Design a protein around this ligand. Structure first.
Ligand SMILES: [Zn+2]
Ligand SMILES: [Zn+2]
Ligand SMILES: [Zn+2]
Lengths: 509, 510, 518
């Protein structure tokens, strides 16, 4: 519980905003039939041309003569639909009120992907950050299913919100016009919950390691649990020693922060039909240890992001605790520690013993996440659960296989993997199934210990890491999502909060 | 067609062995009801013990010898076990009072052996074959295998047994005892054909770049086409110029060997129901060009293998031309050239024009394979085919994604992707479907040219290369098989000939 | 003259656009005291708020239209601020009931705009012209600018607006239309009218440089570049001579010839001359580095960060000089004679290339030990400097993408100037100020000269101990000027715009101002 300091200026908690300006936005959805009113603020048409870089045409009736004139085909023809392109103009409407009207081009393909919709939303937010506005109205002249509509709102909220916690006027109304509006209305408050879970995960990830350490991260988790009435248990070093979690404890040996193991539980009021464990990797800073991250491209400056899997799991607890699904029991776990260089650190070649009795030869101290996950998986399996799903920024190799856009899913059970893929489709957080190739298993055969931590011949590191983790799950359906490539948004210089909505869709559906 | 030489000692053709010692082996399949005769050579029982950890060996087969049966009694056999890969050797006198040789190979503790496990069994067999002067091998299947895995066993046996001695200065009989022997007989000569398709690919790949250059490789293709009875043409520099294949021509500018484009065709006698183009990357040596492969881990000594895709397509032309499927027209295509460093080479930054009119800004001369493939794809599509499948050692990133066992497949058509994945199952050459992620397409936008060759921001190079290639297919189902990771067997120091059986099963299945 | 090809698809010239759409723009400058007519296209106010950081927009001009005046009232504008580079677009109907677009770009709160500030202003303005179809732009200056900065505004607007599509084929921009009219309202308009056509000449010299730099090495090689220089001379009526390998052997230019030994393209040395009618008071040689592609040679550019894919730009010095010849040939200054020189070649890997360790002899008889084949620029420039000095000139100025170390000293905004004569250096810094192309004076440190001592040759090409390679290269060059005022401008860091992925055409206006100032 008390956060240790080196000097009295060392922070002792992670600052967290709960009530955000997004929560004060009043949202109304109207049917397009009947016409759009243009009375105040900024009005944006979402427009495609199914062709390439083709002209903007507005098909919706607008109940304002001045604005209709501006929106005539002969004027809008000047502008083109290239994806993410935008224009907006201030003008007087019929009431001589000054209103801003424009568009964001949605390209020439009728079904937009999640990536295309993010580009549309980015261009919208750029206008929001550049204009003082009480109101934004968005007119849909593109087709969107209910899930993609929800994703439009969650991304708009997340991208719009600015995190100012470490620095020393938002709209108050959102109108949406869309054909068959009544079917979309239910998505609004679901989007607002999914926004906050994602935004909350992002806050934990962006919090630097001096603020977000194993003690302060577990304290934040207890505070979350108290606000949502979840049960919670934080296991400290003496308890972890009794549980014999030698793999996880070895990783944290060189840190000034004691290991803390987070275990939150949501349990439905009714019968419990399904029991799930969600396991997040929780390394609050990864130096690499004695295998220090010193090579070109190692990015040691990004390594506060190595607890992103723990953050996604706590963002999912927010969503779950809020929307309150029936018939389930969810355990949210995370073996939290910090990987540092010290006279007290574990070393390359050390032989260590996991909580299931397996001895492990450490070949590289910067493969610490699979060690802390090993003992977390043994813990999760002893809970007697139906599914275990871990999420982790585990292998740099992911940037060379799927890149920055799709996470990789690996698993021991095809039904569970298909469930994750489905949740990927409905959360619009993209994941792709990659294989656990059994032919590589013999590279983990240690001359001295029961098993090696790493391969010294196989380059397919993300597959080798998966084979290692699978050794710690005996008889339960298990899937492992590797988000090393997708967790950080390099262009925007901030986290994605990747996985909160994926994991929540999985629990809910 | 004459091979240019720098000195008179330079080779002017690739040495190719067509009738191998494997082809001389007389193969007989006998029904195991009937019992096993011993006598000759070496007799090997393939025994498992499913369930039991490392169970004892129990020989179930009837053995038509009183002596050898008394030796193979459970009593004597209990001391040995079935650990996958194990083997033992026995010496005895038979009913004839003649000394014979017998043993077993352990097949483990699952009842249904996997592909890579069958390979481990075959490797153990080959070890016994390499060690001793034998006239005959007999193999008794006391395990269950379907037709498909039986064929795989034979192909793998043949391939592993065959030793390539072309650059240095066997049994005569194979007997096989198996249950329902009549159902397996058909597989024997199919395995023999597939073995040769694969070994033929391997001979072209293993041949070094001084022997195997764009002129000797296309000469070897013409010779193969002549032996099979395939239509062929080789397009030379003057025709390629007329067709405006500027991306492919740029890659070969720095080479002393003129570019040669290989086009073979197999056409069925009947109605032609499906038209297919199979396109193989044909770089006979990849130095990297001015973006020389000088970084640690770049493996420039391996780069004779950069024509592995062309080799797989030619091996497949061997199988197709031999098996003669009906209802099909197949075009076998390779844009063959050599990527070298010269006053004549293309340079990083050069803007080149492909045969479909697209200008391309070269960002790295070592991404040459996609440039040669782009022109070959425009050529394939102009043929009016229904499917285009390319195979290529395209990106070293495959080592980090799937490793050395599974190739990646990418494409623009789910049905074609599914046919490829089916053929991967039936060929036993493993492939995994990977996504063409359209979000990375913006990183090929060029300031000056129609498109960039490479991404300067995205590290997922196997996906970026696929996005590039997709720009050269306008309106045809297409898929792309990246074999960079799987083509060379680093453990055995030789090619796998990967892809020949995959592509053949794809054509045959259609 | 004939460009050699490896295959028949290899290009045999650099494509060059001379009559660009900017040349079709009719420009009219009007005095602001008469008020603005707002009748069509887009009208943009350049607006600041001196003192008030991110202060409000307030329009100060009279506008001769009741409707537009109503829209532009302070109450209406107060939602908007003047932060540098910010902009807004308005749509209304004027008194003649015709639709009209009106806007502003913010010019900040400091009444004196740097070159970089004015560049941000132009960039925002150009974003308003892109992705819009307009026949007319008018710009209202409600800020204070001197004559040079008003000219810089126009040069920059022209250069940034112009899009280079010479190598597009299936991806030509369908929606790219250019304005046909530009109106400018400003205080004391009569005094700025002279800057308009000067801006147009400066834009083109600069765009022309940019076209040659951006042309890839397979289009722009030593033969095609020297051919484009002849064409340029012919259009301008300059005297010209292109020296070929046999002439360069007779002149004993061994350092320059060794660099191009490995190329399939013969070395070509460009010499153009502009000479005033009447009295010639100053003779100047401008020497540009013209390596059309730099692979590094046997010291190949293989290290991480070496950017071999950028090296078509290594003739950027020769482009600047040729763009200068354009402006000089057009503007016709009196009392000068200008020689525009470039030792053009390509640095390649071949059986024929020069090697690390080779000892070559320059045209002044000095023997040089090659320590690195990728220090090729100063070998070419050594022979060009000897040639320039033998012309009997008063000043020699060279310009060159010489050393990557410029990125570590001055970075991407300012070029460095080195030289042997303080008056010349000051004339360059002065022209830097009037051209608005920023240069910083850097020292030639004589204490490093001993590290060029060669055990076998008269001199080493490179230092093996000193890492300040921009200084060492200048000490090397200084050995090839015996008794003439000389300066050297290293543009390796400024020549390429990495953000916008195109050349700046840096140097053309700096060199022209220098010539015209004299
Ligand atoms: Zn880590
Ligand atoms: Zn290659
Ligand atoms: Zn250079």
């Amino acid at each position: 519980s008390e956060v240790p300091q080196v000097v009295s200026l060392d922070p002792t908690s992670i600052p967290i905003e709960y009530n955000t300006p997004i929560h004060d936005i009043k949202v109304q959805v109207y049917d397009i039939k009947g016409g759009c009113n243009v009375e105040e603020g900024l009005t944006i048409f979402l427009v495609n041309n199914p062709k390439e870089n083709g002209p903007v045409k507005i098909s919706s009736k607008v109940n304002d003569k001045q604005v209709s004139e501006f929106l005539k085909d002969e004027n809008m023809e000047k502008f083109n639909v290239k994806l993410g392109t935008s224009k907006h103009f201030y003008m007087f409407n019929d009431n001589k009120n000054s209103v801003a009207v424009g568009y964001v081009g949605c390209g020439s393909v009728a079904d937009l992907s999640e990536a295309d919709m993010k580009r549309v939303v980015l261009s919208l937010v750029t206008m929001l950050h550049d204009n003082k506005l009480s109101k934004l109205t968005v007119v849909f002249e593109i087709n969107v299913d209910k899930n993609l509509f929800r994703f439009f709102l969650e991304t708009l909220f997340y991208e719009y919100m600015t995190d100012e916690r470490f620095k020393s006027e938002y709209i108050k109304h959102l109108g949406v016009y869309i054909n068959n509006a009544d079917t979309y209305k239910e998505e609004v408050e679901k989007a607002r919950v999914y926004y906050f879970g994602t935004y909350y995960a992002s806050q934990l990830i962006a919090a630097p390691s001096n603020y977000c350490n194993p003690v302060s991260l577990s304290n934040a988790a207890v505070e979350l649990a108290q606000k949502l009435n979840l049960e919670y248990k934080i296991l400290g070093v003496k308890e972890l020693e009794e549980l014999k979690m030698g793999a996880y404890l070895s990783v944290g040996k060189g840190s000034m922060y004691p290991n803390k193991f987070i275990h939150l539980t949501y349990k439905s009021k009714g019968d419990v039909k399904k029991k799930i464990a969600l396991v997040g990797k929780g390394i609050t800073f990864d130096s690499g240890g004695y295998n220090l991250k010193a090579a070109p491209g190692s990015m040691i400056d990004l390594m506060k992001f190595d607890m992103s899997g723990c953050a996604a799991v706590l963002g999912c607890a927010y969503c779950v605790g809020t929307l309150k699904p029936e018939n389930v029991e969810i355990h949210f776990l995370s073996a939290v520690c910090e990987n540092m260089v010290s006279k007290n650190s574990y070393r390359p070649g050390d032989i260590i013993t996991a909580s299931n009795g397996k001895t492990i030869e450490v070949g590289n101290t910067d493969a610490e996440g699979r060690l802390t996950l090993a003992d977390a998986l043994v813990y999760a399996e002893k809970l007697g659960v139906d599914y275990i799903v871990d999420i982790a920024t585990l292998t740099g190799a992911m940037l060379y296989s799927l890149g920055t856009s799709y996470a990789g899913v690996f698993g021991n059970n095809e039904e569970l993997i298909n469930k994750i893929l489905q949740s990927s489709k409905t959360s619009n957080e993209p994941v792709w199934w990659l294989p656990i190739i059994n032919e590589y298993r013999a590279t983990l055969n240690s001359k001295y210990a029961d098993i090696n931590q790493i391969s010294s011949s196989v380059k397919a590191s993300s597959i080798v890491a998966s084979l290692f983790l699978k050794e710690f799950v005996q008889n339960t359906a298990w899937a492992h999502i590797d988000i090393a490539g997708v967790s950080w948004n390099f262009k925007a210089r901030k986290p994605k909060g990747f996985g909160v909505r994926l994991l929540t869709e999985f629990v809910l559906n």
